[PDB]
Structure formats: C-alpha cells, structure tokens
Amino acid sequence: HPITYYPVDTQRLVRSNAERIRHKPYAHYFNPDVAVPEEVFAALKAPLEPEQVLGTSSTELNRLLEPGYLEGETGYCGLPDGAGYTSSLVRFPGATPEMFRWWFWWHSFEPERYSLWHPWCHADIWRTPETETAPNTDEQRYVGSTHHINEYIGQDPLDIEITFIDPARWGFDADGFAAAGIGAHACGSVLMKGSHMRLATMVHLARITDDGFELRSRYWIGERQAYEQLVHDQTEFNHLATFLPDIYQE
Amino acid sequence: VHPITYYPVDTQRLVRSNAERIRHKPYAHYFNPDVAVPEEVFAALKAPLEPEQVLGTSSTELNRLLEPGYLEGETGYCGLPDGAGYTSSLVRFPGATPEMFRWWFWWHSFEPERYSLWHPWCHADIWRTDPETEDEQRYVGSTHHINEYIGQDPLDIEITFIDPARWGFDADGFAAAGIGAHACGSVLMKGSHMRLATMVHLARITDDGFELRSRYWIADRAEPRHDPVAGIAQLTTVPGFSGERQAYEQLVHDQTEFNHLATFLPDIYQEFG
Amino acid sequence: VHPITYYPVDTQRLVRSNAERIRHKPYAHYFNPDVAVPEEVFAALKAPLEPEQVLGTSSTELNRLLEPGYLEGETGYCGLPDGAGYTSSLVRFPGATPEMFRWWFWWHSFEPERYSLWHPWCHADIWRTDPETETAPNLTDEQRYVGSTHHINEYIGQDPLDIEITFIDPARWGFDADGFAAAGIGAHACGSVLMKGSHMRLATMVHLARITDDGFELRSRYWIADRAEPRHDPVAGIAQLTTVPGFSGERQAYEQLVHDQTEFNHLATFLPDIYQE
Amino acid sequence: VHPITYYPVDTQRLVRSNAERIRHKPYAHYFNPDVAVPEEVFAALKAPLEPEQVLGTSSTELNRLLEPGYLEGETGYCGLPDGAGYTSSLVRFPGATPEMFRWWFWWHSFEPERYSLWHPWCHADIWRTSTHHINEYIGQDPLDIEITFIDPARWGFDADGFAAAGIGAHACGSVLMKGSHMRLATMVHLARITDDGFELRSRYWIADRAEPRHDPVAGIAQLTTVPGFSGERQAYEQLVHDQTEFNHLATFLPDIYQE
C-alpha cells in the first residue's frame, strides 16, 4: 500500500533530491514511489504491549539469534520515562546479507547515494573518505566509522551522528551469528550533532531466508519518536529492498 | 510450569563453570540456566508409584509401550523389592520431531559444552572413543563416557546404546506404533561396571510434535534378556545406596533436563542439524 | 510464589502419616501439604552468599539486626572456613503480629500434631518435660517457651534428626534485649540446637520478628556446626559437629535455608487464623 | 570517589564520642563515619586557584552565580592579597531537591546529634536561642563560632532572578568567632536544580574585611591580624571540610528527608 502522508518539507526535499541526482550513474534507481506491506498495517494503528518489547540485556539481545520470530517483530511503543521503542521486520527478496554490508558503506560517501534510500527524507550524509577506496572488507568500510546524517524523521529534520560498533560490545554472541543465519549487522549509537545527546541505540540484523534475507531492526529511543521511526524504517527499508540486488550488481 | 526450587550445592558451582566455558561456542545462546517442570507432573514429585503401576522388563511388558494411548504411571518413581528402583517419565516436545531426537542423541556427545546445554546444572563432561563417527548408527553401538550429577555427587558413568530388538522389543512394530526414535541402553558405573540403570527412551509422534516416554530400572539385577554379569555385584550391595532415593533423583533429573531440551530442540536443530 | 519441586522420599511418607494422625484434632483444617516459596528468594536458592554478606556472632554484630532497614544477605546460605555453615532467611508474615509468633512458639510445642501443621513434610515429633507450662496461669507467651527445651524429631534434608532446642533470653548472647521494642522487634525465638545424645552443636539460632505496616517480617540467622554458644566457651568433652565424617556445613546450611523458607512461609499462610481460633 | 586519608587526632576522638552520643536517637541509622571525595576535585586539592578565578563580592559578581553553566574555578581555594582566603566548592546532590536542602539547614540546628550526622568527625556542638552557635573542627583545633543567616538580597543578589536561574535554595551568612567577634567567613551556599537532583555551589570569603554591602565592624580587628593565622590555610581547610561534609550529606539527605 502506497504511503498516504508526506510531510510538507519532505515534499520539497524529494524534488531537490531528484534534481541533483539527475546525471549520476545510479540516477535510474531514484524513485519517489514508497509503499508499506499489508502485513505491517496493524502495527501502524496500535502500540506494542510492554510484553512485546525486547530488553537490552545481553540475554535479551541474543534472543534475536533464535530461529523463527519473537513477539512484536514489527511495532512501536512508549516506555518508562519518556523513552521509546521501535521494532521492524523488512523482507529483502533476491538479496544476500553481503549486499546489506556493502550498502552500509557505499551509500555513505555521497549524499546522492543516500537519497536513493529515502528520496523524501534523506537530505545529507558525510564522513570524514579514504576508506571508500583503501585497498582491502565491506564491514571494515563502515564498522568503527561515524556517519553524520541530516534527515527528516516525521516533520522534524535532525542533524545526527551514528557510530557503528562491533555487536560484541553490546554482549551479542557474535560467534553465533553465522550459525543463526545473521550475515549482516549494523548496530550503533545515534547521537545529536554538537550536544552528543543520545537519541537511540539501534540494531539492524540481516538474517538469511529462503527468498533472500530479512532485516530485523530494533530502536531503543518519545512515544511519538518511536512511531515516526517505525514509519521511517518500513518506508525506507522496503524502498531499499526494491533495488538493492540490482544496484549491488551494477 | 513451575521453576525448580532445589539446586544441590555442587551443581550451583557447575552451572557457573558451564556458563563460563561455553562462551564463544556458536550454540552459546542456547545456554539457559532456567529450569522448570510442568504442573501435570507435580503429583509424581510428591508420592511414589504403586507396585501395580510399574512396568516389567519382559518382552511382553516392554512391548506394551507400543500400545496406543497411555499406561498406568507414565510419570513417577518408586523403590522395588530388592532395594532397586524404578523411574517413569513422560515429557512433551511440542514443535519437535523424532528425527530431531535421534539427531540430538549423537550431536550432543561430541562436545561437553553441547552436553551442558541439556542440563546446565548437572552435566559436567562427556566423551567417546569414536569422535570419527561425526542418526541412529551415530549413537547406537556407541558408548558415552559421562560425568554428571544425579543427586548430590558427581557420577562417572558409561552409557552404551543398543538395538532395542536385543531386549525383546518389537522393533519392526515401532513405525506403526508412532515410535520414530528410541535411545535404549545400559548405564554402568565407571570402574566397577556396576549397573546403575536399564534405560529406555521412546519418542512417539503426537499431534503437536512428539512425546518422550522414558523408563529406568535403577540398580537392577540384569540387562533384559541377559543373565546378571558374573563377578560384578548388584549396585544395591553398596553401603548407603538407596534405589528408591536414586529413582526419585532420576525422576527429578529426567523431568528437569528433558523439559529443558524441549524448550530449544527445534531451534538448535534448525541451526546445527 | 512457586511450589516446592523437591520432596525427599522419607518426607513423602511423613506428610501422609502426619495427615492421618491429625484427623479429628480441633485444628485439623489448618493441615495443608501445599508448600511454596516467594519469587524473591529464588536467587538465594541458586548461589551462595559471599563472605562479606555473613553476619558474625559478636555482640556488636548481633545487634546490627536491630538497625532499621536491611543488611546485606537477608536471605541466603554459605559454607564457612572450617567446615561450618551459615543461613540467613527473611520471611514475610502479612496480616500477623509479633504477638502471634510468641504465642506460636509455645503453643505448637505441646502436641506433635500442632508441630506438624508448621512443616507437614518434615516435622515428625516434639516433646517437652514441662507439660504444666501449657496451662499455668498468668504466664506471658515468652514465659511459656523461653528457658524450655523442645525435643524434636524432624527432617532437615534426607534423614531424620533428633535435636534439642533450648530457648534463651537474647540478652544472654549480648543482644540489647531491652532495646528490642524501640527497634520494632516484637518477638524473638533464639537458642542453641543440640544433637540428641552427643549434644554436639547443630546450630546457634536466631529468629527476630520485626513489625512492618503489613504485619511483621521474620529475620532468621543460623550459624551451623559452630564451636560455641555466643558469649560462652566451647563445652569441654564435646566435639564440634564438623568432626563428624561426611558432615558438610555447607550442604547443611543449604538444607536449613530451604527448610526455613518452606516452613515459615507455610506458617505465614495460617498463623493469623489459627491464632484467632 | 576516594576515601579521606587524613583525620586530625582530635577528630578521631570526636567521631567516637559522636558515635556514642547518637546511639538511641531516631536518626542514629544515618550516622556513618565513612567520608570520601570525588575524583573530579582532586586537582583542586593539589594547587590553588589563580587570582583570575576568584569571584568578588559586589552585586554584579555575586549575580554571576545566576548565569547558566559554570564560572572559572567552581571548585578550589586560594589566599587573597590582604591575607584573607577564598574557597569555592561544587558538590553534587543526585536524587535530591533544593527543598530538602532548605529543610536540612533548619532541621539539623536544634539537636547537636543531628548536626553530628553532617560531619561525624568535625561537628561537636550547636544550639540556638537565626544564629547558630557552633563548636566544630575546621582544621586541627576546635572552633567556637557564630553563624547568622541573612536574606540574600541584603547582599545584592538578584533574588527575583533565582527561580529563573534554577536556584531553589540558598544559605548565606556571616561566620564570626565566639567572644572576639572576629570574622571567619562570608559564606554562600546556592542549591541549583540539575537533571539528576541539584548541585551545591558554595563560596567562602575567609577572614575577609567586611560583610558584603557593609563597612567593617568598628573596633574589631580583621582575623588576618591574629599572629598565627593564615587565610590561605584556612581556605584549604574549608575546601576539604566543604567537600567532605557536603558530599557526605549527599549520601543520605533524600532518605532522611523522607523520614
């Protein structure tokens, strides 16, 4: 189902994104059409129950390594204090997790590449560039790096910084990833520019499936922010799934 | 289910050693110390079986396990007249298949850490003389050399699995009876070779998955369809040994670890089978 | 709460003989074999206390129990350096008053069947040689057990034990007994637990009932197989229990923890009713 | 956090007598001799502030304490030109509120045992007939002092700006010696609201010439005239004293305020 709500400022951004990407060789992947799968619609209408929230203890994070699904794979809710939580499953048919690793460095070296991923919300990305072409591993081209991002989440533009970390630092059983079909990850702290206020802890796990892979994402963020993040994640990662294999191939 | 409320002091140390050494194993996240037993077996924890409810070891008696439905005393324990003991234990495995049980019974035996997943508190060690052997052929005929707690103290035991036909089971009739897996064998004390148990595990297909029906004849006089082993004493001759108490320990032990296994067997089979 | 999942085989017989014996007693309807322990003590059943969490038996250490709030390791067990053991156990008695506890500690002691109410699985027998004390006029609740010796047969583990408990004035051990009321301590049951015959020390035992808004809380301490009664010399001629072949202070302390949590939580379920009746 | 490594010998005796005195008081539970200092002030313990880091006592200077954020030298000590001393001290009170601090500054004053909780080692006596007549150690020797608290505006603080500046409590006073009336300190305690509770920003002008917005008192010499007296040393003693007793109060103020 096509998205029915486009914040006014993103309506401007999609047009300026379209214009500046015109003559890039990956321009033909730029497509504003965004939609969310019928399977997630209920999650758009009702918050998760506190018995569907995953904790951040070593034990709870490693439950994601279990085959099959946990409760509340896709949804959002407010938490104790004004904190927030977001969960989101997105399927990537015809893709492999290696493509997800490659994507998470490749997009980060040009704002126009970043804009492919969410034409409406992605305004700017920068990194402080030798890493793109340094001789010799996909993970080594973004893990341990900081992505400076300017994007819309909801109506609000944000200026944030994401540093990607070895999942082991959070107590993930990294040695168990391969057996569990987890071929990619992207985990990090989301911090505000300047203030360095923590905004979210974020996990993205790419797990091999029969059809390709599936992306399982968790955000520990207020209640509003978690809802915007749910919409954001479903929108941009479903969008990425429509061209990731083709753009990886090319 | 109700959490276990009693953890012998030595096992409290073992569960921590086990947690430590299993770090960085690919199956580490299946290590979970939380153990419990289902409400439906609580009566069996509180009173022994009656003599009438004890299954014998003749071919006729063993083959009653192939009958549809259930027998008297599917779960319980009691002492037997010669100081021996008896344990029966039914454990449900929703979402699993007998194939998974067959797999588990060889796979776990090649690393102590795998063995520890099954009973985090009580399983200390396992080895076999044929590590080359890495479903039935992969554990039947094999001996598992085990160190584990079944009560307060660590035991060194040797479990050799056999073809159930050797004991008079209608092995041909297993398929028709819904028995898709079996693990039957003798449990001997390391060193003395004294018989700790004749042991039967039968996995019967159910609508939800399968159910494990287990029988143990503790400190018995002889392997089924055999003479007692000449020159080796019955375990009941050991001063201070109680077959009744040991049967109770085995009941608690079986219910604890096989219910534990039921909570992750389908998943770990998917990952590693 | 969570139901007990382990019943030693001899106690499975005992609960049945206890049920039979108590029939036609006036208090028979208080007999209930169902036993359970609170979620909050489960961590204590799974790992020992650290040595820093262990209270000593010096007067200064004992009187720490009068401090408001809690100490480290209110519930737990551990082994001690030279074969001895230690048990602490906190049990809540919602809806009860310390007076009921003083009453209970004499009232149960004059009939084995009353004693069986308390731990249906483990309590086999009790006797005292001053039966007159039960009905003597004008005695306080405390006067009816402090100074008395209870001869007890019970399970604290797999096997029956014959023990003798003599209840003392806590002042004898250096407790600021005159300061109990100010500290909200409304009842006590303290004494030495000795083995029948040998008179070896099985435990130095402290039970303090401290007033709460909900009722009271029972704070218990056991120093298992220790060498002397507090403020007293070791008794000449009698070996420490740790000298017995096969005795484990550590294991005994674990049994005492399970035993205390089981029976005092059980007592909490009916103490206010039986006191009322 | 690091335990104090230095206990003057008289205070070793005093923490004991305090321990005995308080035994059967309702609040005896809050008596704890353990005292420590946060890692962050350790630099302040090893070198004096520079002159540029000293706050003055004019209305504009005092009101700089209302400015958001921090000033130069939030924690430290130094000697001043006329032989006087200066102490600044920031102490965090996580879990607490300014109202608790207000409550404390009158509550403690009516029983010597209550005052004892605050600094177990140095606090010996207090009474009233506000003016607090105190016996305590701020150094090696027992001092008989008289602390009288005033309305901040009398020193020229922007009282109407306190709320907007997060200042939920204050305790400003003159500290005088018993008998001689010599001036030991001009003292300011400001409790500023923070995310985790509040922070106490203290300023002392030690052995100073005059109360703010006052002349010196006629016929009474400045304490800097006493033969063996050093404003510099006293300011260091006051820094240690302030960091010790206020970090200590922080460990039990919310609890004791509840009770």
Ligand SMILES: CC(=O)c1c(O)cc(O)cc1O
């Ligand atoms: C009896 C028991 O504890 C047991 C068992 O029934 C099967 C097995 O493969 C290993 C074991 O240690």
